[PDB]
Design an enzyme around this catalytic site. Structure first.
Site, PDB file in Angstrom:
ATOM      1  N   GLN A 185       0.801  -1.226   0.000  1.00  0.00           N
ATOM      2  CA  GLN A 185       0.000   0.000   0.000  1.00  0.00           C
ATOM      3  C   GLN A 185       0.834   1.276   0.000  1.00  0.00           C
ATOM      4  OE1 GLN A 185      -3.946   1.332   0.895  1.00  0.00           O
ATOM      5  NE2 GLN A 185      -2.473   2.316  -0.505  1.00  0.00           N
TER       6      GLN A 185
ATOM      7  N   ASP B   6     -14.575  -2.831  -3.740  1.00  0.00           N
ATOM      8  CA  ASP B   6     -13.354  -2.165  -3.272  1.00  0.00           C
ATOM      9  C   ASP B   6     -13.279  -2.079  -1.729  1.00  0.00           C
ATOM     10  OD1 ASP B   6     -11.652   0.995  -4.216  1.00  0.00           O
ATOM     11  OD2 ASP B   6     -11.000  -0.713  -2.991  1.00  0.00           O
TER      12      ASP B   6
ATOM     13  N   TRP C 284     -11.988   4.286   3.027  1.00  0.00           N
ATOM     14  CA  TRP C 284     -12.269   4.982   1.774  1.00  0.00           C
ATOM     15  C   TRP C 284     -13.749   5.064   1.447  1.00  0.00           C
ATOM     16  CZ3 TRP C 284      -8.448   1.167   1.977  1.00  0.00           C
ATOM     17  CH2 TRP C 284      -7.129   1.658   1.945  1.00  0.00           C
TER      18      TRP C 284
END
Ligand SMILES: [Fe+3]
Ligand SMILES: [Fe+3]
Lengths: 423, 423
Positions: free
Chosen positions: A153, A310, A316
């Site tokens: 990440q 996702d 997010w």
């Protein structure tokens, strides 16, 4: 128990179909000339649609169920989300990860999802979430085939020991090698990171799935390197470019040139409509771009593209019930795939195309395949999508693993009337 | 029958609440200090959310249920949609209109919608749909308060006898005067059409709702005339600008200047997220604009804005189940109203703000109001929105007029487990 699925509709086929089952596999598929009677050991699809299971080609099960922990994002950007996640990552425990992953996995089972690719952040010397997820993979295996993608990440070259940790993740058993070239400090680190990712995938015989150009930057073109390296290694089927939201912002001429390579390379694309509409266009004022990759164009060009959720209730994306028909609904709208046939064929984006992305070897309603299939209480893809139907039954190895008794709505007019919203 | 709603959550309030009912009205609202027992004549909200009814501030009940008749749209544009509609309009019959309007109205009743404003195309010397809709209004009145907006779809000045037909529609009883200045042949006809619309509204004491700047044209600024005329006549509350999608494309400086007038004028705005995301941005290649009006900015400025479905299975929008939580979901995403509080407060966009837009005089959970309220099986607006919950009960004049027994989902793990997707 189950010997047959009867009264089944199949996408792109006329009429009704009988699916015979034996030893956990589909033995034969036979057309019907009318409605068949129910009997014991027959599951009646009741003229609903039968499809292979929904697929989740892109989720982050290590971040799921953490929305607002310890802090919210906020600006609603990719970049702040990573910062908020980094704060949560410092707080991970083994059991924490397993419990949250399992919570979302149960929603996925309930939603007829039998194939899931989870990214797991491996920018973490402790590899806490990865170790937890490897256990979850074994635990959920009766219901879901879980692929684990090692996701660097914070970068491969831009994070201390990033390449070593990525390789350690593969040595521990991760199925897929990840990368994030647009988040590397420099374009050159971005390109180099892809060479290293491909080298690891070839060394370990693993799939590749790159978080690729997830940024509203018309100069973010890491996708061409992903496709070129795949083509060079002859490994297109094994390779996926996730997001490619920068592609929404490319000039048309470069995109046309690029598309030739994209089709020759044979690589897969994942768009994540619920998250992309939220995180992209955040640096525009007005007008504001949509920021989803060129899905409609990909479909027109025969380039394999599919949809992921996702993030589910994560750093997010604060919403979600891990529902693929909902993901599909958003993508059809934002991508303007709103023709009757485009909507109807929409199921491919969350079934067959996603199976291809996961390189699945035993997927689809075909003689000889495992009896893994779901039943939607709808006449076709358009109807399923419009009415956002639940999964009536999910069948795996010829056994029912989930069922939904649908809602029952009544209006009390001069007399009571059942309302089903058909059409 | 019903004397009380018990165990109710209310938006923006802590704890649980009891709503006492008498003679079809709310007599009193009292806080609870714990869970109350059920009894006969108590409707148990079961710690779900109680809100005044959903509102549909913008729908076209004359075009509903005609998607693809006689032809499809196709380019997915406003302009082709009008052409396709014109073809369908030539085929209207009285009973055709009533049957389709009633089909959608039943979905709306099922979805807890008790207030609906329908536009009806009055660019038609026969006024076929209007005459049908005036009957439908009387027929549905026990369940839905239907406002009829006379909509000169082909222009007031740009269609033969357009002004005369608009006035005839008011003389026949239409509640709201419409206009479509961006579809008039010229900017000057656009402005003039608004003067004529305001003059009619004042002559007949009717509300105004203009299809206003529904076009990706940064020069389409009819909204300033709508607001200025409202301010001049002191009639802001009675006036609505629907769509204003051009506002998505304005420069920031003009928008800032304009906003002062928008707040001073007190006029209402309707955004139609499902339709706007589909029809707007169709003349862009890539990147492609979202094309919804400046909802987030309006909310920040205390300008009343709300959401409509616009078209349900019609010439502009082939999907829909007339579901306001679904409309809201799309709008929150496209408008990037994705903060926890923004999502939670989202219900206002399909309840209170829409009631204001319809100039409703008897709306809200307050002592002395009609006992018109719905119960969502959710803890708050965020939860209702996330899980896309059905309306458990709809109550009108203190009587249940709709109910939904929710879906029941089970996964068959080592043991069966009920899945409810909470969180
Ligand atoms: Fe991701
Ligand atoms: Fe409209």
């Amino acid at each position: 128990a189950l010997q047959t699925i009867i009264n089944a509709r199949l996408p792109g086929e006329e009429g009704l179909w009988q699916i015979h089952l034996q030893d956990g596999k589909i033995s034969a598929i036979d057309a019907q000339s009318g409605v068949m009677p129910i009997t014991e050991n027959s599951l009646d699809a009741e003229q609903g649609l039968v499809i292979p299971p929904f697929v989740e080609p892109h989720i982050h099960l290590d971040t799921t169920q953490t929305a607002g922990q310890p802090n919210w994002n906020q600006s609603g950007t990719l970049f702040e989300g990573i910062e908020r996640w980094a704060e949560r990552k410092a707080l991970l425990t083994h059991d924490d990860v397993k419990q949250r992953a399992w919570q979302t996995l149960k929603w996925q089972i309930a939603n007829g999802i039998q194939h899931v690719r989870t990214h797991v952040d491996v920018s973490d010397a402790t590899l806490t979430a990865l170790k937890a997820m490897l256990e979850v993979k074994q635990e959920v295996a009766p219901w879901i085939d879980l692929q684990i993608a090692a996701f660097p990440q914070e970068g491969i070259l831009s994070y201390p020991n990033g390449e070593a940790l990525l390789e350690e993740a593969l040595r521990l058993g991760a199925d897929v090698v990840g990368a994030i070239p647009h988040f590397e400090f420099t374009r050159e680190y971005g390109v180099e990171s892809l060479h290293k990712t491909f080298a690891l995938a070839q060394k370990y015989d693993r799939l590749i799935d790159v978080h690729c150009d997830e940024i509203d930057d018309e100069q973010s073109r890491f996708v061409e390197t992903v496709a070129a390296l795949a083509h060079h290694e002859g490994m297109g089927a094994r390779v996926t470019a996730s997001h490619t939201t920068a592609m929404h912002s490319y000039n048309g001429a470069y995109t046309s040139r690029l598309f030739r390579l994209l089709k020759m390379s044979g690589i897969n694309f994942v768009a994540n409509p619920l998250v992309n509409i939220h995180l992209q266009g955040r640096f525009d004022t007005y007008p504001k771009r949509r920021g989803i990759t060129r899905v409609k164009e990909m479909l027109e060009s025969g380039i394999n593209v599919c949809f992921g959720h996702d993030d589910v209730c994560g750093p997010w994306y604060p919403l979600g019930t891990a529902n693929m028909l909902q993901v599909l609904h958003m993508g059809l709208h934002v991508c303007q795939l709103m023709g009757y046939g485009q909507i109807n064929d929409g199921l491919n984006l969350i079934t067959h195309h996603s199976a291809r992305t996961l390189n699945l070897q035993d997927y689809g309603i075909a003689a000889g395949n495992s009896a893994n299939l779901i039943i939607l209480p709808a006449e076709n893809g358009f109807d399923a999508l419009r009415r956002q139907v639940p999964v009536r039954y999910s069948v795996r190895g010829g056994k029912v693993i989930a069922s939904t008794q649908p809602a029952q709505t009544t209006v009390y007019l001069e007399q009571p009337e059942a309302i089903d919203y058909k059409r």
